[PDB]
């Protein structure tokens, strides 16, 4: 509670900080939704159409 309170006070403080990969990783959900939900359906549907049906 106290660490997050201090950090929220820092966000209240008038200064912009450089974004870091830790906060990017946390905000983008660990990159699991983007990475997995793009690489698994694309390979699955590409394998389906370009191998099973067509080929």
């Amino acid at each position: 509670f106290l660490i997050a309170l201090e950090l929220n006070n820092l966000t209240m403080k008038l200064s912009m900080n450089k974004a870091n990969p830790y906060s990017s990783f946390s905000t983008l959900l660990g990159f699991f939704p983007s990475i997995i939900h793009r690489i698994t359906p694309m390979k699955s549907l590409n394998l389906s159409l370009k191998t099973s049906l067509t080929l």
Partner: protein
């Protein structure tokens, strides 16, 4: 209907006249029209539209097919049933794809390695085993009443 073979899709274009006819059929400019390479996969004269999903299209524009975000009469991608908004997205991300792969794989490998570290270095309390009576509950765990077990004897301390 009134659909005939001349504007229905056909064979792979060879001559520049046939390429221009295919572009006119598909409602594209001659320079913009580009068929799939002639490797015999059945693509024919169907154009190689850029492999971008329908999320790239302008969402504020009043598209003719609003769910598909496409107009009427423009050529359809070969993989529209992949690239609809309910499916695979190719949208630009705020961080690079290789960066996301590296960070996710590094996090997973780091957690696996520290779980192995904690497994080979377990944490416990400075205690002995749990004390149980009656030969460590021989009869109640389903032991044979006829067969007498080894006497597990416990002592005070």
């Amino acid at each position: 209907f009134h659909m005939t073979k001349d504007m229905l899709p056909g064979s792979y274009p060879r001559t520049p006249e046939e390429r221009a006819a295919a572009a006119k059929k598909y409602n594209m400019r001659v320079e913009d029209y580009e068929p799939y390479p002639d490797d015999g996969m059945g693509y024919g004269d169907y154009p190689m539209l850029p492999n971008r999903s329908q999320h790239e299209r302008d969402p504020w524009y009043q598209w003719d097919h609003s769910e598909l975000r496409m107009n009427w009469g423009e050529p359809i991608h070969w993989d529209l049933d992949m690239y609809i908004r309910n499916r695979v997205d190719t949208s630009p991300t705020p961080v690079s794809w290789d960066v996301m792969c590296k960070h996710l794989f590094g996090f997973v490998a780091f957690m696996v390695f520290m779980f192995w570290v904690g497994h080979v270095f377990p944490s416990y309390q400075p205690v002995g085993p749990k004390q149980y009576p009656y030969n460590n509950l021989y009869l109640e765990r389903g032991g044979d009443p006829t067969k007498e077990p080894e006497p597990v004897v416990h002592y005070d301390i």
